[PDB]
Write a protein that binds this ligand. Structure first.
Ligand SMILES: CC(C)CCC[C@@H](C)[C@H]1CC[C@H]2[C@@H]3CC=C4C[C@@H](O)CC[C@]4(C)[C@H]3CC[C@]12C
Ligand SMILES: CC(=O)N[C@@H]1[C@@H](O)[C@H](O)[C@@H](CO)O[C@H]1O
Ligand SMILES: CCCCCCCCCCCC
Ligand SMILES: CCCCCCCCCCCC
Ligand SMILES: CCCCCCCCCCCC
Ligand SMILES: CCCCCCCCCC
Ligand SMILES: CCCCCCCCCC
Ligand SMILES: CCCCCCCC
Ligand SMILES: CCCCCCCC
Ligand SMILES: CCCCCCCC
Ligand SMILES: CCCCCCCC
Ligand SMILES: CCCCCC
Ligand SMILES: CCCCCC
Ligand SMILES: CCCCCC
Ligand SMILES: CCCCCC
Ligand SMILES: CCCCCC
Ligand SMILES: CCCCCC
Ligand SMILES: CCCCCC
Ligand SMILES: CCCCC
Ligand SMILES: [Cl-]
Length: 545
């Protein structure tokens, strides 16, 4: 049937990129004007690049970096670019789990601290959500006050780091301690039975979806979610966010799908897997968007404010809407523990794979010094120790702004499109899209349609290049919560994170040509020759020509 096939592919597609990132990127970019580029990218580059990464991984049986070594010795810097991207992602991504751990710890009491605002951290302008319309014109919300004046202690700006938050600092250590021990002891990403680690996130989502859709104001929120705005489409930013939100959700361009695809058998039909997993992953984001955008509709009518100004147009919308949802449920404390355990579980499985993803890449990149044993065990703590130290800048009072810089630049925006464009440029144009099908029809048993070939050859390069050009022409600098303008150096620092990964592609190109000897035309030609991509003879595998 189909349930066994769904059980076969497990439930690792859903992550924090679906329940935390997509809700606020859609919220930041107006309403439904995010969905049009979202689906355009999903069906033009998202699924095509995802299947391309999986099919290369299973074609070469090689990880993130060595796969490019086999496919095209030139442009091999895509692996190192993916390594830098995943390193910065690991640095700033566990901060979300630190926030989730802090929320979970604070939820272990009789009364949820963010239900009412009568505590020390609350601004005198706070008013209860019910009392805002039941009876200094701007009145802030008790949920927002907990997030900004307790969890974040937001400082006037990124130029005011303030004092390190010790309560958050320990929480950032605990998740790294959890991540350190699990990776070092070889613990599987999903613990014991995978059923609980997979069905529980869905079970809580339907609980939140049912509550959200039943809320009195949910009608307005869904209209905001779905009905698009043509004017917002002219902005090149919404195409940057939607294009890379697909890439973030699918964990492509990170070198993780290629490693995941390397374990598939040569005669395995991954095409149905990628199509199913892609639709399930994006289908969750669209469906879970209904849950969170229904709460905002209820929140907006409760406070008598616009939907676009009811919450934070940045990270922490899932830490503002979802904690608000669990407050309007029977036994609110019980659901808050469950949601933030689900939120913690979803991040941990993603972080276990990615941190081990680079650690496996890093040790294999530099052997003879990272031997499996006393050398690897100290290395695992080394990566975690350094990633914890760089992650400590996002724990300070002004750490929220640094987190937004990393979210916008480190593993999103132009850096992700830079890798995705070069993956499709090498395969479709240098290697040849037709040459890849000759492998695929041998591999999955049947040659696919012309969708994939006409997506790597034209659609993805046009989408990636077109977004990059118009973002530079209509350059709008990054802002946090649509009211804070970043200092010029901060954008320069943010661009360095994007440039550090992007510069890997041209730098390795220079390195390879200088290393090789001979005529330049022969030199570049030699580095463009695939080193027997599928050299495996263990399985009934045909030769590349
Ligand atoms: C590209 C250049 C010209 C931009 C302008 C930089 C100049 C104006 C200098 C003057 C004062 C400087 C700031 C002084 C103190 C700190 C606190 C530290 O924790 C982070 C850097 C930060 C925030 C500095 C950033 C750079 C800064 C703003
Ligand atoms: C009296 C006052 O503070 N009014 C503000 C208003 O200027 C602002 O547009 C609105 C939305 O942020 O919040 C309120
Ligand atoms: C539009 C980009 C064209 C790039 C041409 C690459 C040709 C690859 C030849 C490989 C010979 C082994
Ligand atoms: C031959 C491999 C060279 C890879 C270089 C990676 C550069 C990463 C850091 C970018 C500048 C800080
Ligand atoms: C040492 C390198 C000498 C060659 C420099 C590049 C020449 C490129 C010519 C391209 C003609 C199509
Ligand atoms: C909008 C859906 C686009 C699908 C293109 C054709 C699919 C062929 C079979 C996967
Ligand atoms: C390393 C942080 C400072 C870098 C400033 C120069 C880079 C500007 C990129 C646009
Ligand atoms: C091989 C890349 C390791 C991490 C480099 C990070 C540079 C900012
Ligand atoms: C009475 C408050 C209990 C909070 C426990 C966890 C603190 C991070
Ligand atoms: C037309 C693009 C202008 C960008 C200016 C950026 C200065 C920090
Ligand atoms: C390569 C893009 C240029 C951005 C300039 C930003 C300067 C702070
Ligand atoms: C609503 C946009 C759809 C794009 C093609 C699937
Ligand atoms: C925009 C998606 C196109 C898929 C069919 C060529
Ligand atoms: C529909 C009433 C119950 C709300 C929580 C699911
Ligand atoms: C109060 C019931 C509303 C149902 C909306 C799906
Ligand atoms: C792309 C979403 C369309 C919803 C109905 C206009
Ligand atoms: C929250 C429901 C998820 C459904 C994915 C197909
Ligand atoms: C208008 C409510 C739609 C719900 C889809 C899951
Ligand atoms: C920059 C994150 C740590 C790499 C060793
Ligand atoms: Cl997504």
């Amino acid at each position: 049937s189909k349930i066994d096939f769904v059980l076969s592919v497990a439930g690792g597609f859903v992550g924090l990129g679906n329940v935390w990132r997509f809700p606020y990127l859609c919220y930041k970019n107006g309403g439904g004007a995010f969905l049009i580029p979202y689906f355009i990218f999903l069906f033009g580059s998202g699924l095509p690049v995802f299947f391309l990464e999986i099919i290369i991984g299973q074609y070469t049986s090689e990880g993130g970096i060595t796969c490019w070594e086999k496919i095209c010795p030139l442009f091999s810097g895509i692996g190192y670019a993916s390594v830098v991207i995943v390193s910065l992602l690991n640095v700033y991504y566990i901060v979300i789990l630190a926030w989730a751990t802090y929320y979970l710890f604070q939820s272990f009491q009789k009364e949820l601290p963010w239900a009412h605002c009568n505590h020390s951290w609350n601004t005198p302008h706070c008013m209860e959500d019910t009392m805002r319309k039941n009876k200094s014109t701007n009145f802030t919300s008790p949920v927002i006050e907990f997030w900004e004046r307790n969890v974040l202690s937001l400082s006037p700006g990124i130029d005011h780091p303030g004092s390190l938050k010790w309560d958050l600092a320990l929480c950032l250590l605990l998740v790294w301690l959890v991540c350190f021990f699990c990776i070092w002891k070889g613990v599987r990403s999903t613990g014991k039975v995978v059923y609980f680690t997979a069905t529980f996130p869905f079970a809580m989502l339907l609980v939140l979806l049912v509550r959200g859709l039943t809320l009195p104001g949910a009608g307005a929120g869904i209209k905001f979610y779905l009905y698009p705005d043509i004017t917002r489409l002219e902005d090149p930013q919404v195409w940057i966010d939607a294009g890379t939100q697909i890439f973030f959700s699918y964990a492509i361009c990170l070198g993780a799908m290629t490693s995941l695809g390397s374990y598939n058998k040569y005669k395995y039909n991954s095409y149905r897997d990628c199509m199913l997993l892609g639709c399930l992953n994006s289908g969750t984001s669209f469906v879970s968007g209904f849950a969170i955008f229904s709460i905002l509709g209820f929140m907006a009518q409760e406070q008598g404010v616009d939907i676009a100004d009811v919450a934070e147009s940045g990270p922490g919308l899932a830490f503002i809407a979802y904690p608000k949802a669990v407050t309007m449920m029977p036994l609110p404390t019980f659901w808050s523990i469950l949601f933030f355990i689900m939120l913690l579980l979803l991040g941990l499985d993603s972080q276990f794979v990615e941190v081990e993803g680079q650690i496996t890449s890093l040790v294999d990149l530099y052997p003879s010094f990272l031997r499996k044993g006393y050398r690897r065990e100290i290395f695992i703590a080394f990566v975690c120790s350094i990633s914890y130290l760089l992650g400590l800048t996002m724990v300070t009072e002004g750490g929220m702004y640094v987190f937004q810089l990393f979210d916008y630049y480190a593993a999103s925006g132009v850096c992700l499109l830079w890798v995705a464009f070069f993956e499709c440029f090498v395969i479709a144009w240098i290697y040849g899209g037709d040459n890849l099908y000759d492998g695929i029809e041998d591999m999955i048993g049947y040659r696919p349609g012309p969708w994939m070939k006409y997506s790597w050859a034209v659609i993805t390069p046009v989408l990636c290049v077109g977004c990059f050009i118009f973002s530079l022409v209509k350059y709008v600098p990054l802002t946090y919560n649509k009211t804070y303008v970043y200092p010029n150096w901060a954008i320069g620092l943010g661009w360095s994170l994007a440039l550090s990964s992007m510069l890997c592609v041209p730098l390795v190109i220079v390195i390879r040509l200088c290393q090789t000897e001979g005529p330049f035309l022969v030199r570049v030609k030699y580095l463009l020759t695939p080193r027997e991509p599928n050299r495996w003879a263990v399985e009934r595998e045909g030769a590349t020509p």
